[PDB]
Amino acid sequence: LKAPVVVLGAGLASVSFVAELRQAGYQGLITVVGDEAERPYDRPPLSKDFMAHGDAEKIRLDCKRAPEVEWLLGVTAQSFDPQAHTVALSDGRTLPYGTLVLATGAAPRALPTLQGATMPVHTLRTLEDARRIQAGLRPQSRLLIVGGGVIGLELAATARTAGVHVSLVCRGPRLMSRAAPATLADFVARYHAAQGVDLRFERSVTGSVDGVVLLDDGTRIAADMVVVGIGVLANDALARAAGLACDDGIFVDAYGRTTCPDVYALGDVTRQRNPLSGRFERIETWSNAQNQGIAVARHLVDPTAPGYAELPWYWSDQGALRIQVAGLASGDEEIVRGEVSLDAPKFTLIELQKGRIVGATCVNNARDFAPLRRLLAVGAKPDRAALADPATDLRKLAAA
Amino acid sequence: LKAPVVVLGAGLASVSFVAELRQAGYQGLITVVGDEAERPYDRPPLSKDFMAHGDAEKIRLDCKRAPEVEWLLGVTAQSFDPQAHTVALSDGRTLPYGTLVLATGAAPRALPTLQGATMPVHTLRTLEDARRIQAGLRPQSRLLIVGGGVIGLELAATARTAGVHVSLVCRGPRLMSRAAPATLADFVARYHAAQGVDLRFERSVTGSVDGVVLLDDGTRIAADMVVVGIGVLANDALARAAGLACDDGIFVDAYGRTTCPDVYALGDVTRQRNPLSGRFERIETWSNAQNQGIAVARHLVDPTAPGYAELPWYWSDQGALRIQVAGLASGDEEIVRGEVSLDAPKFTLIELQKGRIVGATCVNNARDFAPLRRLLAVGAKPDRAALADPATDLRKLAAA
Numbered sequence: 124l125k126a127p128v129v130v131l132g133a134g135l136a137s138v139s140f141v142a143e144l145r146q147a148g149y150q151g152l153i154t155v156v157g158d159e160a161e162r163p164y165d166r167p168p169l170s171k172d173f174m175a176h177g178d179a180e181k182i183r184l185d186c187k188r189a190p191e192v193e194w195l196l197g198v199t200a201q202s203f204d205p206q207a208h209t210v211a212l213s214d215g216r217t218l219p220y221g222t223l224v225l226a227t228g229a230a231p232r233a234l235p236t237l238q239g240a241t242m243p244v245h246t247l248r249t250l251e252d253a254r255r256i257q258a259g260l261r262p263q264s265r266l267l268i269v270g271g272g273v274i275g276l277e278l279a280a281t282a283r284t285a286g287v288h289v290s291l292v293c294r295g296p297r298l299m300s301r302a303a304p305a306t307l308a309d310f311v312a313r314y315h316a317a318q319g320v321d322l323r324f325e326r327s328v329t330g331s332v333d334g335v336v337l338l339d340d341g342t343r344i345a346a347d348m349v350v351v352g353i354g355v356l357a358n359d360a361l362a363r364a365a366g367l368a369c370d371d372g373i374f375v376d377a378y379g380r381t382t383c384p385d386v387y388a389l390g391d392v393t394r395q396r397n398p399l400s401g402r403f404e405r406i407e408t409w410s411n412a413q414n415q416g417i418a419v420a421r422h423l424v425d426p427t428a429p430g431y432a433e434l435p436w437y438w439s440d441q442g443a444l445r446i447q448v449a450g451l452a453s454g455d456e457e458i459v460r461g462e463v464s465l466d467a468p469k470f471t472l473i474e475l476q477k478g479r480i481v482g483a484t485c486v487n488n489a490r491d492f493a494p495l496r497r498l499l500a501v502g503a504k505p506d507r508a509a510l511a512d513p514a515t516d517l518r519k520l521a522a523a
Numbered sequence: 524l525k526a527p528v529v530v531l532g533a534g535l536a537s538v539s540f541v542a543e544l545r546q547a548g549y550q551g552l553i554t555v556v557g558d559e560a561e562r563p564y565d566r567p568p569l570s571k572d573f574m575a576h577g578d579a580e581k582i583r584l585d586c587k588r589a590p591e592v593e594w595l596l597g598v599t600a601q602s603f604d605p606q607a608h609t610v611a612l613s614d615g616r617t618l619p620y621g622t623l624v625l626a627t628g629a630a631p632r633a634l635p636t637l638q639g640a641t642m643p644v645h646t647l648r649t650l651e652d653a654r655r656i657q658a659g660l661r662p663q664s665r666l667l668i669v670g671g672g673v674i675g676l677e678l679a680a681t682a683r684t685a686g687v688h689v690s691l692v693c694r695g696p697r698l699m700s701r702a703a704p705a706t707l708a709d710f711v712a713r714y715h716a717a718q719g720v721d722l723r724f725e726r727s728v729t730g731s732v733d734g735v736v737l738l739d740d741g742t743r744i745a746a747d748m749v750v751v752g753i754g755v756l757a758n759d760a761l762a763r764a765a766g767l768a769c770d771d772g773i774f775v776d777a778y779g780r781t782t783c784p785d786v787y788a789l790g791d792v793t794r795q796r797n798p799l800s801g802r803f804e805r806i807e808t809w810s811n812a813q814n815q816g817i818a819v820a821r822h823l824v825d826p827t828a829p830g831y832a833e834l835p836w837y838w839s840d841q842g843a844l845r846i847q848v849a850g851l852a853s854g855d856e857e858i859v860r861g862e863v864s865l866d867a868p869k870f871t872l873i874e875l876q877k878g879r880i881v882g883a884t885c886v887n888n889a890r891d892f893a894p895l896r897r898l899l900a901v902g903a904k905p906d907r908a909a910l911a912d913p914a915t916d917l918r919k920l921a922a923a
């Protein structure tokens with residue numbers, strides 16, 4: 124940890140990182156460069172309560188645990204020179220650094236077949252994106268979602284609640300193909316279908332003409348707005364140009380180190396080891412952004428601290444479904460705890476591999492999720508009849 | 524480049540690297556740690572002329588362009604401490620380093636279903652492996668090859684020439700699924716079948732009993748020896764233990780830098796950018812080991828030198844087939860230059876992507892291969908009728 128510290132990006136990973144630097148006792152300069160001209164804010168509300176209620180002053184991040192930080196908002200870092208240890212800014216200034224931290228996140232993938240569309244086509248990543256989409260969620264209008272991911276499904280639920288007709292086109296046979304158990308994905312489709320979403324599986328968009336989207340089965344879907352949500356691409360251009368190892372994401376180890384000395388990376392922009400799979404992956408979650416930011420900062424201030432070691436998890440709020448998913452989507456066994464039903468949905472899934480818990484899901488059961496995450500953390504091998512047995516107190520198991 | 528230099532591994536990548544350090548003018552200490560108690564040697568002969576003729580003094584690497592190097596042969600590096608800048612050796616000694624270079628290669632994957640086999644089961648990586656296999660290539664004996672890769676096919680050809688019966692089990696529908704055009708793979712199967720190889724596609728080994736191998740179609744293949752060749756796994760254990768970013772291979776950038784300052788990696792052990800695909804891959808070729816070693820050394824001595832930038836290629840010698848393959852196996856177009864025939868085989872394939880050459884293959888035509896590699900290097904977009912037209916002088920095109 125060499126002063127001064129410069130962080131590129133002012134999202135959750137950056138804020139979490141700089142707050143932890145201060146909390147851990149680093150007192151040198153910290154400067155954060157953020158391209159959005161917005162008080163730093165959290166993204167999960169954008170497809171949830173913000174999309175529904177519109178108050179950005181409810182979604183700001185707390186920068187108070189990060190005192191003495193200069194935030195350069197509305198400024199783009201255009202390049203860095205890792206030999207000279209400088210960053211070039213879009214406003215004409217240059218920042219020196221002792222330690223540079225790349226926390227530039229990821230951007231929605233564009234859909235090539237809708238390039239040159241002459242109807243509204245949006246993606247949902249930023250506060251600006253959310254305001255734009257919300258401005259078009261007119262009651263009785265028609266929205267088409269492209270993609271099977273959670274964000275689009277959250278938007279679908281929000282739109283249905285607002286009286287918007289919703290169709291959805293998914294290239295795969297199931298929703299939430301990324302990091303979600305099939306049992307959950309199947310149930311989620313049943314839920315959305317019951318709420319009036321017109322779901323089209325194993326279909327791809329081939330183009331659009333005069334307000335109508337074309338599909339690869341030779342059919343058409345008319346819509347007033349398309350929201351594309353087919354995933355994101357790491358914002359790793361500065362790293363690539365500067366000679367760091369990257370491949371849709373900046374490769375980092377558990378200390379957040381890139382292949383360039385004195386340059387670290389955090390959050391959505393990184394490709395990193397998933398300890399459960401033992402494979403490198405680009406993790407796309409709120410918990411990773413916060414936890415990785417904190418762990419990297421902690422180890423920078425105190426090199427005796429362990430590297431980042433938290434296991435993955437996320438949540439999604441889709442209408443009546445409060446979904447929580449931890450670890451791996453599958454193993455060699457799933458245990459279903461409770462009944463899977465559209466009538467007052469409430470259930471828990473546990474994924475095991477040779478008796479060891481490797482993942483869990485809770486739908487409308489936050490109380491189960493925390494002890495399951497602890498059991499997951501230590502690779503617990505509990506009695507499987509009991510795991511299924513409704514009589515079982517999971518918090519007790521975790522404590523033991 | 525901080526002295527002293529320590530290199531772990533004494534294969535081609537290591538030898539190429541240390542020779543280039545010396546040629547570029549570095550005069551500080553160089554120590555190489557090699558676990559094999561063998562004068563450094565090249566691997567391609569092991570499934571080719573060595574397997575056929577057995578003289579190891581024809582396969583040694585030239586270490587003369589690497590003067591003043593201490594080679595610690597028959598010694599295993601057990602760990603390194605990147606803070607203390609030391610390496611712990613199996614003989615009880617410790618080496619200090621200013622710059623550490625990991626060139627530890629890769630080892631054959633074991634076949635889980637043949638663990639506990641009570642018949643000879645070998646892999647083919649080392650001089651020791653080759654001598655062991657050769658000692659069992661008795662005329663009229665039966666050899667089973669598991670895997671569709673080039674090394675097993677080279678062994679198959681060598682064995683057939685020696686009068687050994689050969690069967691081969693391939694899990695995929697084609698041979699050489701890795702980095703070989705389908706047109707080449709199909710022809711190669713026809714060639715081996717014509718030479719008496721018993722080829723079994725889309726079959727996997729499920730086990731073995733009393734000298735007989737079991738397949739997933741419920742059938743059996745008796746053999747006197749099994750040689751498993753289903754690929755290799757990077758020898759990245761020291762890197763993993765020391766906290767470097769790895770995933771079946773040590774991630775490096777074009778300068779050979781790992782995520783740990785002062786630690787570099789080269790050769791088969793690395794996962795690195797393929798410039799043609801723009802994706803990270805573990806390259807498994809002789810040309811990469813030599814070229815990457817040279818480029819990394821050059822840039823260490825002269826930081827103004829470019830990073831590693833060579834495009835991939837390899838060759839394979841399979842009986843009457845002298846195969847050369849460069850670049851990508853496929854694009855959006857293949858041009859076939861010549862006829863594809865078992866009667867005096869000689870042809871060239873060119874792979875294009877939107878008119879740009881992205882790969883090439885020559886079978887028994889070394890003269891075509893060099894100019895094609897040059898056209899590939901600059902992403903040439905030549906006239907495609909001419910590329911197909913037999914009248915065409917490719918060397919002239921390259922020069923122009």
Ligand SMILES: Cc1cc2nc3c(=O)[nH]c(=O)nc-3n(C[C@H](O)[C@H](O)[C@H](O)COP(=O)(O)OP(=O)(O)OC[C@H]3O[C@@H](n4cnc5c(N)ncnc54)[C@H](O)[C@@H]3O)c2cc1C
Nearest residue numbers: 132134135136158166167200227228390391407408409437
């Ligand atoms: C709509 C939506 C809903 C979500 N819901 C959930 C959820 O319920 N649960 C969950 O687990 N996760 C959710 N996520 C995911 C989560 O929010 C992300 O994982 C998180 O935002 C990643 O934080 P980050 O700081 O790494 O990246 P970002 O939030 O993308 O922040 C990076 C910032 O850096 C900026 N930047 C990029 N390049 C430059 C540059 N050259 N110069 C200056 N600035 C630059 C970016 O524009 C951006 O402002 C959601 C995301 C979205 C978009």
Ligand SMILES: Cc1cc2nc3c(=O)[nH]c(=O)nc-3n(C[C@H](O)[C@H](O)[C@H](O)COP(=O)(O)OP(=O)(O)OC[C@H]3O[C@@H](n4cnc5c(N)ncnc54)[C@H](O)[C@@H]3O)c2cc1C
Nearest residue numbers: 532534535536558566567600627628790791807808809837
């Ligand atoms: C049979 C065979 C045929 C081949 N034919 C061809 C061909 O025709 N064309 C082609 O393009 N490529 C071919 N190859 C591939 C090629 O030879 C490899 O790409 C090349 O050997 C890689 O070189 P390397 O130095 O990175 O690794 P290696 O050659 O594997 O050298 C690494 C060395 O480091 C040692 N080591 C590992 N760990 C330690 C440790 N902890 N301490 C000390 N030493 C350690 C290893 O045991 C090994 O001796 C062939 C390979 C084989 C095995």
